[model samples]
Target: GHMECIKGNVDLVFLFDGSMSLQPDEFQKILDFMKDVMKKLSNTSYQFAAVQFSTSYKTEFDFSDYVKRKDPDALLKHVKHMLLLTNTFGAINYVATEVFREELGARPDATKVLIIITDGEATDSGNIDAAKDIIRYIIGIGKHFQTKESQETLHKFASKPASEFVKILDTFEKLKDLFTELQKKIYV
Candidate 1:
C-alpha cells in the first residue's frame, strides 16, 4: 500500500560484515547467494554498490554510474570476489555513523539507499554510533530509496552469528519478493 506513493529510479548500497567471526567460505556462500537476487533485479535502471566491512570498510562493487538491466551478473560477480577481514561491530553506531555516511553521503542520487549487514558489535574503542546515524540520516527524508526495506533487511541480516548463517540465508531468500514488490511499484 505504501509503495503506491513511490515513483522513481533507485540506487542501493549493500554492506556486508567480512570479519574473522565469519569464515571465507561462509562469505563466499553469501556472495554466491546474491546471484539469485540479481536474477530478480534484472529489469530496472538500478545501480548497486557492495561494501565489505571488516576492521574497516572496503568497497567491493560499485556500479552507481551505469548498470545494464540485462547484466545483473556484473553485480553478482562483484560480490563473489568479496574478501573477509577480522574483528568488527555489533553496536549500531560504531560501524555506520561516519563510515557509511562519509562513504555513501557523497552520492546524492535521487533515490539513495544503504543496507549494512554485520554479525557483532563495534568492540573497538570510541563510540559506535554509525548505525543510528545512517538510519536516522535516511529516515530524515533525504533522497533515499526503500528506507523501510533497507532497514528491515539490515536488521534481519545482522540478527545472527556465523553459526547461524542459515538465518542469513533465509533472510536473503526473501529478497526476490522485495524486488518484485519494488518493480510493481515503479512502472518505468
Candidate 2:
C-alpha cells in the first residue's frame, strides 16, 4: 500500500528451520527467496542476520557481515543446509541470547524484529518462553503445518494477533507474493 522503504530503521534477523523438512535443495530455494526479500528491503537503515537450524545451528550471517558486505548473494550462497532434525526453539534461543546482543552488532535504538520460517515441527519448545521480548513473525510452510495442531503451535511462535503476524502457506514461486507481504509486516 504505502511506498516501500518507508520504514527502514530496523534490525531484522531470520531464524529458519532448514531441517529434513527442506533438507538441502528446498532449503537453498528459500534462502534464494531470502535474498530477494533482502534485496527489496535494501536500504541503509535495515540491517540483517540469519540463523539456520536443525540438529545443528549455524549463523549464516550477522549484522556485522551485512555491514561489511551489502550483497545478500554473497552471504546466502555459501549457506549449506542441515539435513538433520529440527530444533526450532534452540535457534530461537540463540537468536534471543546471542544474535541480538549488542556485542554482536545489534543496534540498541533500532527495532529488533525476527522472522521465522519453519515446517511447524520442533523437538521441543526449548527456551521459547524466554523469546517473547521482541517483535516476531512466524511463517509456516509445507503441508505438515496445515494440521490444526501444528498451526496452533506455530501461531504461538509469532507475536500478538496471529492473523497478521503469522502466515501459513500450508503448502512457491509463491515466495514472490510472500516477500511483498513480508515487507508490509516488517514495516508496519
Candidate 3:
C-alpha cells in the first residue's frame, strides 16, 4: 500500500455541518471537538481554517492573517449552531473555489486537507460536479447512517479508498477517539 507522508507543513480546513439533523447536545460535542483539535494541533508549522454549513455557509475563521494564533478559545467562541438544511455539496465547492485560495491564506506548496464532519445527508447536489477538484475526507456522525443510502452518500463524497477516508460513528461521543487517531495518522 502506498501511503503519503503526513507533514507539518499543511493547510487544513474543516467543513463542519450545523444542520437541523443534529441534536442540540450533538452540536455541543462538535464545538468541543473543534476546541480539542485546535488545542492539539496548535503550532507554528500548521495553519487552520473552518467553515460551518447548513442552508448557507459561514466562515468561522480563515487561513487569513494570524491563523497561526491557534487560539482554541477564540475558535470555540466563533462557532454557533445554524440549524437549517444540509447543503454539503455546495459548501465543498465553496471551499475549493474560494476558501483555499492564496488570498484566503492557503499555501499552494502546503499539503491541502479538507475534513468534512456531517450527519450524512445532503439537500442539494447543485455544485457537486465541482467537488472533484478538492480532496476531502468525510466523517459521518449519528445513528441515521445505519441505512444503505446514508452510507453510500458519505462514501461517494470521501476521497479515494473510502475505507481510508470515510469514518462513521453512531454518535458524537466517539469524536475524541476519532480525532486522536487522526492526530496519530497526521503526525506520523
Candidate 4:
C-alpha cells in the first residue's frame, strides 16, 4: 500500500464500561491493557479518544488531547485517576453520535475507530435502539459519499469476568484481530 493511501491519521475512541461490577483490581487491569496499547502505538499517528459508559457515557479525553503519544507514563496516570465507576448506558450514545459529532462525522480518508470495553452486562436498555440507530445513521452517510467512504469501525470488546483474560482467548483474540483488520478495511 502506498503511504498516501494509508489511514495513518486515525482517531480511536475507547468506550470503557466502568460500572461497580468491576473491582478496583479488575478496573486497574483494564487500565493496564490501555497502558499497553498506548505504549505499543506510541510512535504511530493514531490519535486515541476514550469514553466510559455505565449509568451513562462520558468522554474521559478527546482526540489527541487525552492521548499524549509521547508520554506513556502520563497516559497511564490519567487512566488510573480518571477511572469512574458508573452504571449508565445513556452515556454511550450521547457521546458517540451527538456529543462529539464534529470529531467523527460522516467522512472518508479518516478512520474513526470505536473500542468499547465492558465488564458487566447492560445497565441501560435504552441504548439498544440507540446503537442500532447510530449504526444505521452512519451507514446512511455512505450514499452521499463520492468515494468508497464508510465509517469503517469496530464494536465492543466485552467479556463475562474480565479477570480471566486468557480464558476467553478464542472469542476475545478473534475480535481483537478483527479490530486491527478494520483499520485496513477502510483504507484498502
Candidate 5:
C-alpha cells in the first residue's frame, strides 16, 4: 500500500531464470510476482517488459506488448519456462543491447530498471559492462545462492551499492516483501 510519487516516465523489465532447477510451482510464483508488481505501479507513468532465460533467453513481452492489451493477465499468460541449462550471461547481454534499445521503444529520458530473479547460481560467464548504465536489482532464492561465490556474482552484476540492490531470500514467496520495499525505491 504505497503511493506513486514518480512523475517521470519509467521503463522496467524483469529478467527471470527459467532454468531446470526451478520447480513448476515456483515458476508460477514468479509470474504472480510480476502480476503483483504490475498492479502496484499501475497508476504510475510506467511501462513493463519481461524476459525468461533457461539455455537461452526469450522476450516474453516488451513495452509495446503490454501497451497493446494494457492487461497484466495477458502478459502473464505468455510466460513459459524452458527448463534447460542456466545461461544468465546471455540474458543480461541480450536485454542490455537488444531488449532495451531505443529501436524497441526505449525512452531516452525515462528511468530504466532491470529486475533479475534467479533461483540458482549462474552456469556461464560474461562481462556485465554493457549493463552498467541501467539500474539493476538481483533477487536470489534458496541456500545455493547464499555462498560467497554466488553472492559475489550477484554483487558484480547488480548496480552500485549492493546493500540497496541485492536481495537474498529463502524462497520466492518472500518476494512480496522485497517488492514492497522496492516499491519505495522505484518511485524515489
Candidate 6:
C-alpha cells in the first residue's frame, strides 16, 4: 500500500461525466471510481471537489466539504446523475470560474489539478490554457477513445507531454489500474 506521500499543498477536482450514454450500473461504477480515488489519496493533504456534467453541470462538493467529511463515502454520498447531453467543455469552463475560485475553497498557494473522467465522446467544445500550472489528466473509459481521432481529442484536452496526461481505459473496472500512477503524479 502507498504511504502518506503528499509533497505540498494540492487542490484537485474531478470533472466527471453524467450523460445519458451511461447506464445506471455504469453510473454507479464511476461513483465508485471517485470514491476509490479519494481513498487512495486520503493519506495526503489533498483537497477534493467534484463536479458532474451532462448538458448541464452541478457541484457535487467543494474542498471544504471534503475537509469536513474526510471520508469519500460521506462526501460523495448524494451525487446524482444527470442523463442529458455531454457538455464536457461547458463544465470545465464553469469550474474555473466558480468551484475552483478562492471563495469556493480553492487555495491560492496550492497547486491545482483537474482530473477529467468521461465515457462519452462529448457534444460540446472548448479548452483551457495549460500555461497556468493546472494539470489536466483526461481519462477516457470506452472503445471509442481507442481510435486515433478520439485519442487526439483527449490529448488536446490534457496537459502537454500527452502520453503522461492522457489515459484511455477499456472499462470502468480498469480505472483502478491507474491509481498507483495517478497517485505518483498527483503527489508531485
Name the best candidate (by TM-score): 5
- For residue 26, model 3's alpha carbon misses the true position, in angstroms, by 0.9
Q: What residue runs in model 2 are displaced by over 4 Å at the alpha carbon?
A: 1-8, 184-188
Clashes of each: 15, 0, 0, 7, 0, 0
- Alpha carbon deviation, residue 84, candidate 1 (Å): 6.6
**Model 2: per-residue Cα lDDT at residue 11:** 86
Where model 5 places Cα greater than 4 Å from the true spot, the runs are 1-7
lDDT of 3 by residue, 1-188 (tens): 11246565788788999998888899888888877877787764678888999998988888874375668677657577998998888898888776888988888887777889998588887645665645678888888788867787877677878888888888789998987777756663
Q: Candidate 4, which ten residues in sequence have the lowest lDDT sum?
A: 135-144
**Model 2, 137: alpha-carbon shift in Å?**
0.4
Residue 112 in candidate 5 has what lDDT? 78
CA displacement after TM-score superposition, residue 9 of candidate 6 (Å): 0.5
Q: Write the per-residue lDDT of candidate 2 for residues 40-153, one digit (tens) a residue.
A: 878657889999888878888989988889999998878777777888777888888888878778898877778888874777665577677677887778778767777888
Off by over 4 Å in 1: 1-6, 64-109, 125-188
lDDT of each: 0.43, 0.77, 0.79, 0.45, 0.81, 0.79
**lDDT by residue for model 4 over 31-61, one digit each (tens)?**
5555556566666766666666665465666
For each candidate, give its TM-score against the true structure.
0.50, 0.88, 0.90, 0.55, 0.91, 0.89
Q: What clash pairs does model 3 have?
A: none
Q: Can you write out model 6's per-residue Cα lDDT over 63-157, one digit (the tens) per residue? A: 88888788999888888888998887777787777777787788998777788999868788766652246777788988667687877877767
RMSD of each: 9.6, 2.9, 2.0, 11.5, 2.9, 3.3
In model 4, the clashing pairs are 54-87, 54-88, 55-87, 55-88, 56-88, 56-91, 57-91
lDDT minimum window of 10 residues, candidate 5: 1-10
The TM-score that candidate 5 achieves is 0.91
Clash pairs of candidate 5?
A: none
TM-score of 6: 0.89
